[PDB]
Design a protein around this ligand. Structure first.
Ligand SMILES: *Cc1cc2c(cc1C)nc1c(=O)[nH]c(=O)nc-1n2C[C@H](O)[C@H](O)[C@H](O)COP(=O)(O)OP(=O)(O)OC[C@H]1O[C@@H](n2cnc3c(N)ncnc32)[C@H](O)[C@@H]1O
Ligand SMILES: *Cc1cc2c(cc1C)nc1c(=O)[nH]c(=O)nc-1n2C[C@H](O)[C@H](O)[C@H](O)COP(=O)(O)OP(=O)(O)OC[C@H]1O[C@@H](n2cnc3c(N)ncnc32)[C@H](O)[C@@H]1O
Ligand SMILES: NCc1ccccc1
Ligand SMILES: [Mg+2]
Ligand SMILES: [Mg+2]
Lengths: 448, 448
């Protein structure tokens, strides 16, 4: 017997359980994995931390900054200095201190028009009810790719825009409804907030990585509250409480918080069954496709050449890269992503085949010293059974307006959390925490 | 240990099991419901059969026609005589000998070039590998809605077309990729095949309903081979065979056929985990949304007025209606559907609210005598835990080309069936049967 069972020890699950323990209520956290952090995962390699999942926090992300300060974790800034390389479908790799300077006069004007036109739509989309936007019906009936085609923008602008879209959504402009993209932009506070390093979501990292931050949040839970290696298979409820079925136990609670990715929330045996609109919503919330990698070098060699370690390649399998070198200055790390179709193709291949593809791109852009590789570590989040895709769900056309209203509504004694339910910074560590705080409040109120 | 374990006792599972049984191999069929038939379901009300699920067969559908003949189930024609009624927005209702004769000559002509153009794309799309169509990249990056608009047809014809798209797909023009819609059309052999009564998919019905035919197919198996009320929770495999975990215990086989809808196949605890391309495919194959109803009257009072009982109302919540009166000529029945968005809105309401909306549409079209209703029977197939939407799965933009190639590929000892894996009449009973025949052939070859 306990008051609240939380399913998932992500930042959402942990946030909710901690709020509930502090109001003095009994709480169990059932986590499928042998660890906490979920879509945040940190491993120790070559005497430093390797963030295989979520790794960056930025300005406007007040909850994860508050949590990092409170638990004693310091931040370091994402290296920003030196030349970025851009390589288009044709021509040579271009060096410039800013990605923007690679574009022509007419092209940069078109890219800022496009970015401004998109934020204007974004500001009309309510964060708590994207389906109540005044033009929701037409915006949900259109892909992001069809809207971009409609603006009359040249190919080289649509090219670099699509690299940024796949970097942010882990999906192509063709998979996303315009309304989903608009809502996501609005939830971040604009396009600059999503794409920028300095003054944006990629500004800062955590010293020791992010999974350690989660492990400190877990330490604040009482002894016996956290149950690792304990998948939830079943969730029954009646007029008196909820029974959670695991591999060979039942837990009884008054109320429940499900804090898993949408695709996984639908895989649980609900009794009674979930109402129709909520089951179909989960079927219309597919997770993205990403393979995150780190290429390990003895030194961050590109710094001496005046390079940032950032390359941008619209016509390549690798979208975008960052200097991932820790504050000590060694080892050298180049961090990068396969996004969307490129992630699905590379997930079918071996780690070693994926290493060869990454190093070929870097040799052509950063230079020949990209081949002196000390190690290669990557992670296909589509292959993780307890995530089934990063960064989080996108919604294709027709999904927000028809099924979307069932996103947060509790079903009897069962409440929903996870970053996909957040109003602000949806898809980010920040959004997960907001979601944990909301769900804890609804539950604390209802127990009363 | 048996030769083959089949998951699902729909037409796909029962066809695969009977073909494995005829070839001399041991077979077990595990079904979650207390009945066979899946998306076909027949109940007795008012001294006749009510098809709550699939009810129609037509010319072209040679697998269902041969099964009905072999197990001795008779057909009767869908009634067609009498004036159809068409109603447009605030306007008054119009009688004509046929639906198509309430449209100007230039309108009827725009409609048939549109159908014609769709068929032209359809015939370029290979039935077994739509991802290999010559403009596959371009047709998978586009909605059917964007193709209808950029065709440039007029407004009152795109609205007639939307009714038909929703009758066929149980999903709007905006939710479907052009490649998915084209494949479907090829699969059925053209647009008249999908839409027409005489000469198409709604030509014939089965005396006594469709579930009894599924029962006669099930009776070809030995005692103990079919297990009802036995949902499959787990499917594990190794180098020597497969293990099925159910509430009751375990079943071991050499090979498995999974013949459930794509959404439910993904909810099985697979061990090892499914490969990422196949898990993410299932996340991108959501079921349609449909509520199917039969309005019961003492007599088919509309025939006495020279009406067919078919209404087309492009602006109303219900799609097309049919005369569902059986051959004895009583009771009077009007059959129809809420499709896509209107099915989700109606699913959220009560049986009495849905009845009121249907009777209101029929009152203003067939006449005011429709309000004196003896009974109203419907089923929201979205609310069925063991289906989760009819008529079947659709694919949104970007899914066929990126995730689609894993649709039929066996994962070690686990083979795939269900109407969604059919090449011909995908989405129909006929396609369910083809998938079972192909799945049984594949597994018998892989045993040796
Ligand atoms: C994967 C990823 C994510 C990501 C990103 C890069 C990658 C490769 N980069 C980010 C970044 O730089 N900055 C940032 O803020 N976010 C970034 N993201 C997104 C971020 O990781 C997520 O938004 C966030 O971590 C989501 O947290 P939430 O708590 O909402 O979800 P979760 O971590 O997925 O936790 C769910 C837990 O539930 C367990 N699980 C799943 N099913 C069950 C069942 N049935 N029973 C028990 N437990 C279950 C999972 O194991 C997980 O622990
Ligand atoms: C729903 C519907 C379908 C339909 C239609 C109208 C409606 C409202 N009208 C049709 C028509 O007039 N003519 C026609 O040919 N088709 C029509 N459709 C579609 C047609 O019914 C379906 O395409 C066809 O029945 C599909 O058959 P299939 O064998 O592929 O699929 P199924 O019936 O869904 O069978 C699946 C079975 O598996 C069981 N299940 C699900 N999960 C599990 C687990 N985990 N373990 C064990 N069993 C499981 C289901 O219970 C079901 O029996
Ligand atoms: N967390 C969103 C993201 C990931 C990689 C690159 C840019 C942005
Ligand atoms: Mg810089
Ligand atoms: Mg007629």
């Amino acid at each position: 017997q306990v008051d609240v069972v939380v399913v998932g020890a992500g930042f959402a699950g942990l946030t909710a359980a901690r709020a509930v323990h502090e109001a003095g209520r009994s709480v169990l956290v059932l986590e499928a994995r042998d660890r906490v952090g979920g879509r945040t995962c940190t491993e120790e390699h070559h005497g430093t931390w390797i963030d295989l999942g979520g790794q960056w926090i930025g300005p406007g992300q007040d909850r994860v900054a508050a949590l990092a300060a409170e638990l004693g974790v310091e931040t370091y800034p994402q290296p920003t200095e030196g030349d970025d390389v851009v390589l288009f479908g044709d021509g040579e790799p271009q060096r410039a201190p800013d990605v923007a300077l690679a574009f022509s006069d007419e092209e940069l004007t078109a890219y800022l028009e496009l970015a401004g036109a998109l934020e204007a739509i974004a500001e009309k989309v309510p964060l708590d009810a994207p389906w109540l936007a005044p033009e929701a019906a037409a915006w949900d009936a259109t892909t992001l790719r069809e809207w971009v085609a409609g603006t009359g923008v040249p190919d080289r602008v649509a090219g670099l825009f699509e690299v940024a879209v796949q970097a942010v959504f882990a999906a192509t402009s063709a998979q996303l409804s315009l309304l989903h993209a608009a809502h996501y932009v609005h939830s971040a506070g604009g396009w600059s907030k999503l794409t920028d390093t300095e003054g944006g979501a990629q500004q800062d990292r955590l010293v020791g990585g992010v999974q350690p931050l989660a492990e400190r949040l877990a330490a604040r839970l009482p002894d016996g509250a956290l149950r690792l290696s304990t998948p939830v298979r079943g969730l029954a409820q009646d007029g008196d409480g909820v029974t959670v079925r695991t591999a060979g136990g039942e837990v009884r609670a008054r109320r429940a918080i499900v804090a898993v990715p949408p695709t996984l929330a639908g895989r649980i045996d609900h009794d009674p069954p979930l109402p129709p609109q909520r089951d179909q919503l989960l079927q219309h919330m597919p997770q993205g496709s990403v393979v995150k990698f780190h290429v390990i070098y003895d030194e961050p060699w590109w710094r001496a050449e005046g390079l940032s370690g950032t390359v941008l390649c619209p016509d390549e399998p690798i979208g975008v890269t960052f200097d991932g070198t820790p504050p000590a200055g060694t080892p050298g790390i180049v961090t990068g992503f396969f996004e969307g179709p490129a992630a699905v193709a590379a997930g079918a291949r071996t780690r070693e085949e994926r290493r060869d593809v990454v190093v070929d791109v870097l040799a052509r852009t950063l230079g020949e010293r990209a081949r002196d590789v000390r190690d290669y570590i990557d992670r296909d989040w589509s292959a993780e059974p307890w995530t089934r895709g990063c960064y989080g769900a996108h919604l294709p056309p027709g999904a927000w307006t028809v099924y979307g209203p069932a996103l947060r509504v509790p079903v009897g004694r069962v409440h929903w959390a996870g970053t996909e339910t957040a109003e602000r910074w949806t898809g980010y560590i920040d959004g997960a925490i907001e979601s944990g705080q909301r769900a804890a409040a609804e539950v604390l109120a209802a127990l009363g």
